Design a protein around this ligand. Structure first.
Ligand code: CLA
Ligand code: CLA
Ligand code: CLA
Ligand code: CLA
Ligand code: CLA
Ligand code: CLA
Ligand SMILES: CC(=O)O[C@H]1CC(C)(C)C(=C=C/C(C)=C/C=C/C(C)=C/C=C/C=C(C)/C=C\C=C(/C)C(=O)C[C@@]23O[C@]2(C)C[C@@H](O)CC3(C)C)[C@](C)(O)C1
Ligand SMILES: CC(=O)O[C@H]1CC(C)(C)C(=C=C/C(C)=C/C=C\C(C)=C/C=C\C=C(C)\C=C\C=C(/C)C(=O)C[C@@]23O[C@]2(C)C[C@@H](O)CC3(C)C)[C@](C)(O)C1
Ligand SMILES: CC1=C(C#C/C(C)=C/C=C/C(C)=C/C=C/C=C(C)/C=C/C=C(C)/C=C/[C@@]23O[C@]2(C)C[C@@H](O)CC3(C)C)C(C)(C)C[C@H](O)C1
Ligand SMILES: CC1=C(/C=C/C(C)=C/C=C/C(C)=C/C=C/C=C(C)/C=C/C=C(C)/C=C/C2=C(C)CCCC2(C)C)C(C)(C)CCC1
Ligand SMILES: CC1=C(C/C=C(\C)CCC[C@H](C)CCC[C@H](C)CCCC(C)C)C(=O)c2ccccc2C1=O
Ligand code: SF4
Ligand code: SF4
Ligand code: SF4
Lengths: 49, 185, 732, 80, 33, 131, 168
């Protein structure tokens, strides 16, 4: 997790909808957290099955 | 009416969910109650801030340029700073909750009953002896019993507040201030 | 079973992904589920119907709610011909500021304009305020809940209906004809007389005053006395302004004929009389079958006795009673067929005899409604033939129907199929040939050498009803005709005005160009029918596969032998006919749109002259009217037609994607998937994760279905954008 | 998995059993034909549904009929 | 206020609901009763 | 050898549309739905092969094989009944100085191996056992 | 064979005199399609009991002491609903709902139709015959109330006059 989270904030922060906004980095962080949640759901479901 | 029968029927109709503790169960009663108790604090805090004008630059809308269309309520109209701040506070809390749900400890009360968690047995036992109509005194202090009693109380209060607010045609914040004696405002 | 397809052990024990795909698509074939008894089948179907009804009501409730909460009905009511109706609001977080402004034009918030015609219908039926619409939505939500309760109730042990109840034809028909259709119509005329007509004249009659506001000044006295003529006296003047009392009348039941002068729609009084008459007819007809009261007809006897004495029709209709009662597929086929005809009729008669106020002036809505119902009609028609074939393969008893009218049909199958083939060929060769002749001569610069046949027969029919332009002095077009004398003092006065008014769609003028398109539509119907009919007749067997009945309605093939047996099942006929259905409906819809477009634009001549050859359709219709759509979004900006523009391109994608499934077959893909499996199992890290359902390629029939769906969805979506953006972009 | 049935019209040409790609068919003794042999399908659990057998039958209508049915790893020819 | 509902429900209907539904279907089809 | 090992599987034939367990069973007794790869020093597919220092390619380490000696036994066991029928017929046709079915089998298979024995007509056998 | 109530018609089979109030009245034969008359009996009782209260209430409200406070004074029974307000009405509805859902199994079960346990001390210390007599009294009163309800309501909206106003 430590490895995959660090590199994911980049794509969102520099190319996202609010990249040029002063709150762009903050938005990027939130987006990354969202993606992590989706991936975590997948892991949970996989384990169950 | 016997309560037990209704719960049994629910389990039968929806067995899969019941297995984890979802639905009309002690686990839910405990967790939902804990959240309600905590919320009361949040709602009272919001009232205090509103009355004492603590929230910075309220009654103003976030910029549609700095923020995005996600901040729009209708057309180009945007959310006021106050509501935004209140939401962020709640988000701080929700994040803690998500971590606790996804990454539980070895000595923690998990949201759902998992046979593979070390605390499964204790939780199953606690829930088995925590059911009743009347608060069981003699177990005052920090006990599972006290927690459930206080939780039920808090949840009832939420219902009452909404109803009273409607009957008196007032905001919930106003009713809170009223029940406190008008201290916040 | 213990896996996903609980109703099928065969699929459940499958080790591949097919288990999931097939289980989903075989879910509603309750008849084939493991361990299904006839009683259970009927009971489950009955309950499922309750659910469908609930969905329909929830849908209606939503429209009312959203129009009431986010629409402009009241403003529209005030100025109907200068306001664009709103459907629902838009909250898309992906929109840019520019888009928010474009879609918010004319209003204060982003919104979608409705082309469903609900505003006109509701305005006509009596709705005037948003609060009224709200009440309706709430009521329907409640009714939906009641229906859901019924579904549960009749699946309970003591309320499950018996198989006999499900097969009492007489009682159901009597009840459905007399009560569902007859009494309901009587109730509707009640509403029209009590609420609608008063509203048109400026009076408000609602739940607050309906019991104290008499619909007619005389009262119910004339009705019981027998002096019914009183209810038809004092019809609204020709100077009546709708929704106001200026020039109003008192009549409630009349046979004026024609359209209200101001709203250009049928008179409400006439509609009330219409439903009243229909009511009596149906109520009387519902007293024909025996239902535990002695009197009545027994359907079996009626069918059995009808055998032509000459023997030309064999044993007649003996045996059909049992076949129909014991086959749900035949029943469904008969129903779908009749409903299909009804849907087409609604489309055809609704654009000519406009029923709602100010609907004729809304060009885009009028166009959408026609294309909507015509397409639905096509699907309904194809389904009827499909279930007819399923019947032959599954429920047909050769012995019961011995020398029956049905069996004899399967005896001269070759004759029917062959002759239908000839018809298709004749129509095809000459229609295409004439079009190409006209194209070539025109291209060479000699339009005077075109073969253009006047539609004389149709023109005659129009004249017979009163049209005078064609100069055929016949029937109602003749002042000396006995027919004219009969209705000259009844309904003709109003009709002869509308039929002879160039600004109405009542019997639009026809010319040489219409002749050809009509013959093309004929080709479509005949060829689509050939495919479907052949599929039905050759579903129980053929020379190539004399044992087809033992394999079922849908099977992949019968092997690469005996010459090759691809697409030999009956299901494949449905698959092939779908394409033709879409083509024919497309031709029909194109014709309606272009003709009307030119009329609305004020240049009827363009169609009259350019419709004779194919290039005209491509250049003066598809190319010319696509300019607004393709410019929804350009390198210089965007407008409210952007959504429609995007959808147009989206449709093309889905359509073409469909081609992949249709032209490419399984073998190639299966081999490729195998290589991918190897990779996943041999790539480190990913090896950690593995599947529980072996990855395999889609089946032969599955691919056909998937492809047809992609083709169909793209087809409809692309045209939907064009018909809306083109009409709205130019005339709205 | 799949179902293979042999009918009385068989002539014991052995062509079917010589075409099966998975040894599902055999030639068993019989007296209804001049050849004194009939085909049998002892191991239908290995039928892949190729229908090569049907393509080889010389009878007016196939004496060997393969009706596709439930699918297993073997019938779906999955080496993975 | 009801006006805020579009911005509170759409996120849920188009994102949260579909996700949970798909998850449940997967768990249902991957289970061996 | 358990001749029914394959037949003893979890497969349950359906009513209509299924050939059945056939002659050797329709599916393997074991379930293919096992897990994926595991970290060094761990095992996943039950009696799996330890991947050693390359757990990523453990599935490529074979553990299922055929012993040539054992192969002989399976051949004999699965073809026991056929041999029985063959010898029985040979016995029925008045064998010269016959002894015991089993004895005859051994003598007849001592020569002509076993495979050849299974593929020989009773007539050929009698000719062979004339001595 | 022939109905007691209607002497010129044949009595439906299910009506055998077992249940209270069985005067052999089912001219339209609505009893045959039903497996049993339990659910129907529950409904008859429920409908009747509600009607009993309604008729009494209507008369009282028109000619009786109202509760203290405005909005609780309108004599018109129909206007009362709106006057009293949504809050009051909703609370009653919710209460009724609770009782209805709590006794759900009873309604759809196989117990004595109409018995939810609210028997007070009555219907006790009495023989079966006496019990039936009481039950018959209830059903008779239920039916009377239902007929009365229709009349009262119809008279109110047709004649537009008070229930106890008898003028000709
Ligand atoms: C496939 C091509 C493609 C690409 C490259 C982009 C790119 C982008 N889109 Mg877009 N988009 C596309 C197709 C594409 N779009 C399509 C088809 C649609 C229609 C549905 C859209 C609709 C769309 C919307 C609606 C929006 C965007 C947005 C964005 C931007 C945000 C990027 C982001 O958050 O990604 C996040 C990416 C990741 C989390 C992962 C990136 C992949 C990694 C880098 C791969 C690494 C591989 C690695 C090298 C392997 C070796 C490893 C080894 C060495 C160890 C970005 C410029 C947003 C924007 O602001 O527009 C500018 C936005 O709001 N897109
Ligand atoms: C009242 C109408 C009605 C009823 C009750 C039935 C009932 C039935 N039909 Mg039938 N049918 C109908 C109308 C009807 N049909 C019509 C109008 C047609 C013509 C198209 C057909 C054509 C037809 C065929 C060809 C077949 C049936 C079959 C069946 C049976 C099984 C259905 C099934 O397995 O579906 C299970 C559930 C599904 C298939 C889910 C449907 C998913 C659809 C295909 C895709 C949805 C569209 C797409 C996703 C939209 C997304 C677009 C978006 C991107 C914008 C069932 C008895 C089948 C059968 O064998 O019966 C014996 C069969 O083979 N029907
Ligand atoms: C442009 C595309 C196209 C065209 C032209 C056709 C044409 C035809 N299809 Mg067809 N089809 C198509 C696409 C097309 N299909 C697709 C995409 C599908 C998939 C669903 C099908 C599925 C389908 C089915 C399932 C069936 C047909 C049938 C037919 C025939 C109908 C009878 C007819 O029109 O006779 C006239 C035919 C033509 C005019 C076309 C050929 C014209 C050539 C150029 C000759 C012109 C001669 C000219 C008049 C001058 C002659 C004299 C000269 C020699 C001097 C016809 C040959 C039916 C059939 O077999 O017919 C009975 C049938 O059952 N089609
Ligand atoms: C109704 C459904 C719906 C909704 C509400 C949204 C909403 C959004 N999308 Mg979107 N999207 C959708 C469907 C939807 N999408 C579909 C179907 C597709 C596939 C075609 C896409 C593809 C897409 C792309 C490619 C991109 C978006 C982006 C965005 C964001 C742009 C606005 C903004 O401020 O970005 C700035 C972002 C923020 C201010 C962060 C907001 C906080 C996040 C969203 C929290 C998420 C946590 C969430 C609860 C986790 C889910 C858990 C799971 C169980 C469901 C916005 C949140 C863009 C983006 O930035 O993504 C985030 C972007 O690049 N969308
Ligand atoms: C069908 C039953 C019924 C219904 C729906 C109503 C409805 C109404 N009554 Mg009314 N009423 C009823 C029976 C009913 N009444 C009877 C039987 C009496 C005589 C005791 C009265 C006497 C009465 C008075 C004196 C007044 C009303 C008034 C009203 C209105 C305000 C509510 C209120 O204050 O009630 C008051 C209710 C009571 C005084 C007692 C009600 C008796 C209940 C039905 C006993 C049954 C309880 C049940 C068995 C157990 C609980 C059920 C479950 C929820 C747990 C409202 C429209 C008020 C009004 O005028 O509004 C404008 C008012 O002043 N009612
Ligand atoms: C329990 C039921 C019941 C009762 C007691 C009443 C009672 C009354 N109604 Mg009424 N009504 C009812 C049901 C009832 N109605 C129903 C169901 C409807 C239709 C929805 C109506 C419609 C109605 C209208 C439209 C009118 C009345 C009127 C009247 C009043 C005068 C009736 C009259 O002149 O009869 C006279 C009776 C006769 C001329 C015939 C003689 C009676 C027969 C021959 C035998 C009677 C004996 C029988 C056992 C009755 C005993 C039962 C009773 C004593 C409890 C009276 C207070 C009238 C009025 O002015 O009241 C304000 C009036 O205008 N009612
Ligand atoms: C500020 C202050 O303090 O001053 C007060 C003073 C004062 C005067 C008191 C005021 C007042 C008035 C008040 C508070 C009035 C409250 C009125 C209230 C609460 C009124 C009805 C409940 C109705 C019921 C229960 C009806 C039917 C229940 C029925 C009909 C049933 O049949 C139940 C049913 O079970 C049966 C029996 C059989 C079952 O098989 C079936 C079901 C389950 C359906 C003021 C002025 O407002 C304010
Ligand atoms: C295949 C099919 O559909 O067949 C169906 C058709 C149909 C019609 C449905 C059937 C039926 C039912 C019947 C019996 C139909 C027959 C006739 C029908 C339609 C109805 C009945 C009587 C009407 C009467 C007695 C008139 C009252 C009319 C009276 C008393 C008056 O004239 C009042 C009035 O005089 C005053 C006082 C003064 C005048 O200034 C004004 C007038 C003149 C208006 C059938 C025959 O059973 C089967
Ligand atoms: C009908 C029937 C029965 C019944 C019943 C009845 C009475 C059912 C009623 C059940 C009832 C009424 C249950 C209330 C729940 C309230 C909850 C969960 C509140 C949660 C509150 C939470 C989680 C708090 C959240 C917040 O803190 C957060 C999240 C953010 C803060 O910013 C703000 C607040 C504080 C808000 C019988 C008779 C019993 C049996 C019969 O068989 C069936
Ligand atoms: C497959 C099948 C099926 C189906 C079938 C179908 C689908 C059919 C259709 C059919 C149709 C779809 C038909 C149509 C018809 C039409 C008609 C029959 C018409 C007629 C007309 C007339 C009679 C006349 C009219 C008129 C008048 C009235 C007057 C004058 C003018 C005129 C013209 C208008 C089933 C299921 C049964 C089963 C068996 C097989
Ligand atoms: C592309 C292609 C494929 C391969 C296409 C495939 C495998 C589709 C795979 C993607 C779809 C969208 C399924 C993916 C589903 C997700 C993995 C999520 C599934 C979740 C489950 C719970 C349903 C065929 O199998 C095929 C067969 C016969 C003729 C033509 C073709 C053909 O053209
Ligand atoms: S579907 Fe396959 S096996 Fe059947 S005829 Fe076509 S190519 Fe041959
Ligand atoms: S279908 Fe193929 S595998 Fe099956 S018996 Fe015929 S040749 Fe053999
Ligand atoms: S090919 Fe046909 S006829 Fe010849 S042996 Fe096989 S089944 Fe019999």
């Amino acid at each position: 997790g430590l490895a995959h989270g660090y590199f994911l904030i980049g794509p969102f922060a520099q190319l996202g909808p609010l990249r040029n906004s002063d709150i762009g980095l903050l938005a990027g962080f939130l987006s990354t957290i969202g993606l992590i949640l989706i991936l975590t759901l997948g892991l949970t479901i996989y384990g169950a099955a | 009416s016997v309560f037990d029968d209704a719960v049994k029927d629910w389990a039968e109709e929806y067995p899969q969910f019941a297995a984890w503790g979802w639905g009309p169960s002690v686990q839910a009663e405990i967790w939902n109650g804990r959240h309600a108790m905590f919320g009361w604090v949040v709602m009272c805090a919001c009232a205090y801030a509103k009355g004492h004008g603590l929230i910075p630059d309220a009654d103003q809308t976030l910029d549609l340029k700095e923020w995005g269309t996600l901040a729009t309520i209708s057309g180009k109209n945007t959310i006021t700073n106050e509501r935004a701040i209140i939401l962020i506070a709640n988000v701080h809390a929700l994040m803690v909750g998500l971590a606790a749900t996804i990454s539980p400890n070895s000595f923690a009360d998990t949201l759902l009953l998992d046979p593979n968690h070390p605390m499964y047995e204790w939780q199953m036992e606690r829930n088995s002896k925590l059911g009743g109509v009347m608060p069981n005194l003699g177990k005052m202090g920090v006990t599972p019993e006290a927690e459930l009693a206080n939780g039920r109380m808090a949840m009832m209060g939420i219902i009452t507040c909404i109803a009273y607010s409607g009957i008196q045609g007032q905001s919930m914040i106003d009713t809170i201030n009223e029940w406190v004696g008008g201290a916040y405002f | 079973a213990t896996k996903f397809p609980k109703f099928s052990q065969a699929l459940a024990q499958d080790p591949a992904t097919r288990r999931i795909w097939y289980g989903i698509a075989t879910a509603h074939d309750l008849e084939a589920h493991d361990g299904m008894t006839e009683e259970n089948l009927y009971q489950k179907i009955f309950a499922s119907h309750f659910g469908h009804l609930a969905i329909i009501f929830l849908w209606t409730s939503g429209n009312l709610f959203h129009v009431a909460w986010q629409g402009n009905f009241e403003k529209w009511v005030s100025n109907p011909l200068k306001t664009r109706p709103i459907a629902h609001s838009i909250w898309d977080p992906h929109f840019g500021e520019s888009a928010l402004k474009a879609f918010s034009k004319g209003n204060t918030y982003p919104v979608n304009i409705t082309f469903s015609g609900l505003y006109q219908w509701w305005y006509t039926i009596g709705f005037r305020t948003n609060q009224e619409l709200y009440k309706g939505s709430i009521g329907l939500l409640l009714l939906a809940s009641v229906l859901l309760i019924a579904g549960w109730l009749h699946l309970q042990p003591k309320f499950r209906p018996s198989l006999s109840w499900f097969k009492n034809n007489e009682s159901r028909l009597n009840h459905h004809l007399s009560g569902l259709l007859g009494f309901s119509s009587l109730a509707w005329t009640g509403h029209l007389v009590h609420v609608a007509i008063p509203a048109s004249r400026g009076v408000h009659v609602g739940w607050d005053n309906f019991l104290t506001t008499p619909p007619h000044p005389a009262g119910l006295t004339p009705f019981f006395t027998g002096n019914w003529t009183v209810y038809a006296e004092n019809p609204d003047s020709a100077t009546h302004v709708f929704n106001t009392s200026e020039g109003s009348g008192t009549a409630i039941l009349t046979f004026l004929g024609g359209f209200h002068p101001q709203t250009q729609s049928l008179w409400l009084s006439d509609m009330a009389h219409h439903h009243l008459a229909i009511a009596v007819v149906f109520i009387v007809a519902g007293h024909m079958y025996r239902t535990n009261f002695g009197i009545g007809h027994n359907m079996k006897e009626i069918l059995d006795a009808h055998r032509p004495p000459g023997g030309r029709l064999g044993a007649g209709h003996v045996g059909l009673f049992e076949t129909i009662t014991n086959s749900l597929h035949m029943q469904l086929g008969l129903a779908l067929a009749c409903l299909g005809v009804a849907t087409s009729l609604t489309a055809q008669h609704m654009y000519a005899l406009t029923p709602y106020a100010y609907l004729s002036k809304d060009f885009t809505t009028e166009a959408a409604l026609y294309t909507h119902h015509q397409y639905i009609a096509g699907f309904l028609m194809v389904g009827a033939f499909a279930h007819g074939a399923i019947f032959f393969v599954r429920d047909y008893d050769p012995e019961l129907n011995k020398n029956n009218v049905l069996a004899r049909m399967l005896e001269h199958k070759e004759a029917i199929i062959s002759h239908l083939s000839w018809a298709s060929l004749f129509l095809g060769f000459h229609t295409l040939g004439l079009y190409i002749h006209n194209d070539t001569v025109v291209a060479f610069g000699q339009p005077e050498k075109q073969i253009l046949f006047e539609p004389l027969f149709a023109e005659y029919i129009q004249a017979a009803s009163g049209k005078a332009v064609y100069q055929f002095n016949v029937l109602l077009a003749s002042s000396t005709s006995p027919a004219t004398a009969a209705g000259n003092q009844v309904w003709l006065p109003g009709w002869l005005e509308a039929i002879n008014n160039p600004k109405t769609d009542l019997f639009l003028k026809i010319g040489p160009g219409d002749f050809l398109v009509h013959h093309a539509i004929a080709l479509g119907l005949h060829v689509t029918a050939l495919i479907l009919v052949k599929g039905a007749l050759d579903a129980r067997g053929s020379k190539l596969m004399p044992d087809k009945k033992d394999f079922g309605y849908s099977f992949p093939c019968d092997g690469p032998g005996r010459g090759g047996t691809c697409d030999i099942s009956a299901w494949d006929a449905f698959y092939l006919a779908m394409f033709w259905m879409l083509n024919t409906i497309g031709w029909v819809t194109f014709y309606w749109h272009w003709k009307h477009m030119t009329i609305w634009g004020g240049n009827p001549g363009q169609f009259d002259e350019s419709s004779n050859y194919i290039m005209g359709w491509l250049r003066d219709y598809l190319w010319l009217n696509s300019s607004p759509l393709i410019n929804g979004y350009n390198p210089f900006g965007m407008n409210n037609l952007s959504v429609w523009s995007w959808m147009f391109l989206f449709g093309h994608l889905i359509w073409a994607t469909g081609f992949m499934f249709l032209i490419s077959w399984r073998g190639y893909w299966q081999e490729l998937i195998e290589t991918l499996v190897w990779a996943h199992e041999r790539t480190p890290l990913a090896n950690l994760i593995r599947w529980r359902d072996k990855p395999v390629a889609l089946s032969i029939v599955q691919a056909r279905l998937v492809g047809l769906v992609h083709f169909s969805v793209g087809y409809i979506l692309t045209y939907a954008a064009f018909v809306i953006a083109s009409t709205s972009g130019k005339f709205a | 998995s799949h179902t293979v049935k042999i009918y009385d019209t068989c002539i014991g040409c052995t062509q079917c059993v010589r075409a099966c790609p998975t040894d599902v068919l055999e030639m068993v003794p019989w007296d209804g034909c001049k050849s004194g042999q009939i085909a049998s399908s002892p191991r239908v659990e290995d039928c892949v549904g190729c229908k090569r057998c049907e393509t080889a039958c010389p009878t007016d209508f196939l004496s060997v009929r393969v009706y596709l049915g439930a699918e297993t790893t073997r019938s779906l020819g999955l080496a993975y | 206020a009801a006006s805020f509902l579009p911005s509170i429900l759409v996120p849920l209907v188009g994102l949260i609901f579909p996700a949970f539904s798909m998850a449940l279907f997967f768990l249902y089809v991957q289970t061996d009763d | 050898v358990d001749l029914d090992y394959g037949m003893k599987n979890s497969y349950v034939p359906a009513t209509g549309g299924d050939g059945g367990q056939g002659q050797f069973g329709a599916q393997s007794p074991n379930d293919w739905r096992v897990a994926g790869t595991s970290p060094v020093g761990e095992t996943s597919y039950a009696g799996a092969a330890d991947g050693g220092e390359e757990p990523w390619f453990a599935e490529a380490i074979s553990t299922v094989s055929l012993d040539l000696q054992k192969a002989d036994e399976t051949l004999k066991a699965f073809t026991k009944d056929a041999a029985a029928f063959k010898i029985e017929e040979f016995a029925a046709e008045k064998p010269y100085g016959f002894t015991s079915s089993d004895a005859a089998m051994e003598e007849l298979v001592g020569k002509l191996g076993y495979s050849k024995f299974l593929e020989m007509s009773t007539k050929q056998l009698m000719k062979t056992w004339g001595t | 064979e022939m109905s007691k109530s209607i002497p010129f018609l044949t009595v439906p089979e299910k009506l055998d005199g077992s249940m209270a109030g069985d005067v052999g009245f089912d001219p339209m034969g609505l009893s045959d399609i039903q497996t049993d008359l339990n659910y129907a009996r529950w409904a008859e009782l429920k409908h009747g009991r509600i009607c009993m209260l309604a008729v009494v209430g209507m008369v009282w409200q028109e000619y009786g002491p109202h509760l203290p406070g405005d909005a609780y004074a309108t004599k018109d029974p129909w206007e009362a609903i709106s006057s009293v307000g949504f809050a009051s009405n909703f609370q009653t509805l919710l209460a009724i709902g609770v009782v209805e859902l709590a006794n759900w199994n009873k309604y759809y079960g196989d117990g004595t139709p109409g018995d939810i346990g609210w028997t007070g001390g009555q219907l006790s210390k009495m023989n079966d015959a006496q019990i039936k007599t009481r039950m018959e009294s209830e059903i008779v009163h239920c039916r009377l109330a239902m007929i009365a309800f229709i009349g009262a309501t119809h008279q109110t909206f047709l004649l537009h006059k008070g229930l106890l106003d008898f003028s000709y």
